[PDB]
Amino acid sequence: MIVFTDLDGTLLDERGELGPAREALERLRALGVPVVPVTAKTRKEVEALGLEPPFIVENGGGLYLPRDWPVRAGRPKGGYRVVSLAWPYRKVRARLREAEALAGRPILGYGDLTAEAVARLTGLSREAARRAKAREYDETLVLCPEEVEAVLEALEAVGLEWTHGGRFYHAAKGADKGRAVARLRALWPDPEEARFAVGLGDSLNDLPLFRAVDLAVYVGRGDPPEGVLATPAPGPEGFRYAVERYLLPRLS
Amino acid sequence: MIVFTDLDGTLLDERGELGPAREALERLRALGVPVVPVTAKTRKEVEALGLEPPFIVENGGGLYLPRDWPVRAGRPKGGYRVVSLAWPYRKVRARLREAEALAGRPILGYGDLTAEAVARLTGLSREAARRAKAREYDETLVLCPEEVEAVLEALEAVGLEWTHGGRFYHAAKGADKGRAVARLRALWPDPEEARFAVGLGDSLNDLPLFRAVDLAVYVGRGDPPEGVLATPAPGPEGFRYAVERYLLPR
Numbered sequence: 001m002i003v004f005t006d007l008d009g010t011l012l013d014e015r016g017e018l019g020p021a022r023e024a025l026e027r028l029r030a031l032g033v034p035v036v037p038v039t040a041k042t043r044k045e046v047e048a049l050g051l052e053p054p055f056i057v058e059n060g061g062g063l064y065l066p067r068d069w070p071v072r073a074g075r076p077k078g079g080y081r082v083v084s085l086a087w088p089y090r091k092v093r094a095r096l097r098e099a100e101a102l103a104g105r106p107i108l109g110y111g112d113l114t115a116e117a118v119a120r121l122t123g124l125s126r127e128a129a130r131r132a133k134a135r136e137y138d139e140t141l142v143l144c145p146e147e148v149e150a151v152l153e154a155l156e157a158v159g160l161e162w163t164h165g166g167r168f169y170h171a172a173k174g175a176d177k178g179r180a181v182a183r184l185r186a187l188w189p190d191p192e193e194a195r196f197a198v199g200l201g202d203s204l205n206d207l208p209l210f211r212a213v214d215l216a217v218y219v220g221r222g223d224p225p226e227g228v229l230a231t232p233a234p235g236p237e238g239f240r241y242a243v244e245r246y247l248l249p250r251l252s
Numbered sequence: 253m254i255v256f257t258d259l260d261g262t263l264l265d266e267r268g269e270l271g272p273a274r275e276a277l278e279r280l281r282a283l284g285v286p287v288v289p290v291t292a293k294t295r296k297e298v299e300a301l302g303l304e305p306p307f308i309v310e311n312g313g314g315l316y317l318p319r320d321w322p323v324r325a326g327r328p329k330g331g332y333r334v335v336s337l338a339w340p341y342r343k344v345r346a347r348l349r350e351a352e353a354l355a356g357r358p359i360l361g362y363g364d365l366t367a368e369a370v371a372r373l374t375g376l377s378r379e380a381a382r383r384a385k386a387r388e389y390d391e392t393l394v395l396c397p398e399e400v401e402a403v404l405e406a407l408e409a410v411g412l413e414w415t416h417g418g419r420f421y422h423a424a425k426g427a428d429k430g431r432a433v434a435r436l437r438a439l440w441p442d443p444e445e446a447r448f449a450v451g452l453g454d455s456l457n458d459l460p461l462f463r464a465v466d467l468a469v470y471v472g473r474g475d476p477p478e479g480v481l482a483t484p485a486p487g488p489e490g491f492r493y494a495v496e497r498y499l500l501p502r
């Protein structure tokens with residue numbers, strides 16, 4: 001069994017700390033059950049949380065492995081090997097300019113904004129904001145609700161894909177949480193262990209995750225996606241409940 | 253006679269310079285008629301156009317005089333004396349953050365954006381956008397259509413004023429082209445010379461300028477505001493025209 005989990009609003013509390021899901025992760029770690037973050041966050045944000053690879057960043061844009069992963073794949077980055085699944089940020093940013101032309105209205109994302117500005121929009125510290133700005137694949141859009149339909153049509157018109165992560169829309173090309181999970185499972189050095197995948201998530205960007213795994217659990221505040229298991233409380237209390245009530249039984 | 257003039261689409265053609273107004277200006281120089289730019293542009297922007305003080309920047313927020321101006325006014329600042337008429341940019345930005353809270357929604361302006369973002373927004377080059385970002389009095393806002401009214405209400409609730417500059421909204425406190433014009437005329441060395449003032453402008457954004465001068469001329473695309481003269485062709489072709497029709501014969 002492998003557990004793939006979203007970070008923001010699933011394994012992380014409202015501020016951005018792992019605290020409340022610590023004992024839940026403890027149990028899995030003690031049972032030797034691999035837990036893999038699959039998140040909209042950047043590699044720099046993930047690293048600051050102290051998390052080790054493997055993990056998947058930027059909505060499936062990038063898969064980061066340990067340098068000594070027994071299956072050779074991706075390119076060296078000192079301590080990592082990186083598998084790129086999506087277009088690079090620079091290319092998305094260029095295609096967004098074309099979209100803005102079509103929409104006839106500015107389309108701003110993090111790349112347009114100062115760290116100070118990002119920090120005010122997101123409630124992050126200035127330093128955390130600099131890390132959220134260090135994007136390699138996916139752009140976070142800052143859109144007015146009234147213009148969303150127009151902007152999203154302009155994205156698709158120029159060949160970009162969009163998704164929504166809880167508070168912000170994102171644009172990318174080839175970044176899908178499900179595709180990245182599928183790749184990692186195929187690169188897993190123990191086929192048996194990767195036979196059964198569990199996926200936990202809370203927003204739109206997690207739908208492709210729920211299709212890529214064998215047991216899907218929704219911990220968001222809405223009602224669950226079609227035929228997906230749900231929990232009594234959202235968030236980390238949801239994560240804890242799922243581990244104790246859905247997973248452990250299957251591991252005994 | 254003193255000539256007060258907007259730069260956008262008045263002296264400056266669509267390209268960014270002034271073709272047809274060039275001889276019109278040299279002529280004015282010949283008869284010793286002072287010309288004073290009155291603009292939404294920053295001092296850095298105005299200097300890059302190679303313009304000399306006196307001039308009025310940021311919609312009337314600041315009056316820049318030659319350091320050796322015969323009338324002592326303003327605070328010395330290198331080769332300039334500066335008369336500040338408006339709240340400083342940093343104070344405007346602080347108030348904008350209160351307005352965001354009242355409005356319950358983000359309010360973005362140039363101060364939040366990179367120069368590259370500003371350039372793409374305005375059609376300027378990166379280096380010109382850095383100059384546009386060096387604001388001392390007023391903020392340029394990047395608002396969306398449906399939230400504009402909530403935001404404007406919020407701005408006025410926290411003590412700011414707003415204007416529409418043609419492309420974007422602007423927020424400031426105390427910046428008014430008319431007030432800066434009235435102040436410069438009061439600080440003019442030769443009072444007889446400041447007695448007759450002409451104003452040439454684009455858009456209704458120059459209506460405060462039109463009110464502070466004795467002869468107002470509109471060279472925009474729309475219909476001239478009530479009580480303002482108009483020209484056939486807009487831009488520096490209207491400046492040129494207005495100068496040989498209204499001015500040169502004096």
Ligand SMILES: O=C(O)[C@@H](CO)O[C@H]1O[C@H](CO)[C@@H](O)[C@H](O)[C@@H]1O
Nearest residue numbers: 008040041042132140165166167168
């Ligand atoms: O879409 C959002 O709601 C979140 C979570 O999905 O992602 C963005 O927003 C987060 C901040 O809330 C950033 O930390 C991420 O890097 C990303 O920019």
Ligand SMILES: [Mg+2]
Nearest residue numbers: 006008009202
């Ligand atoms: Mg999430």
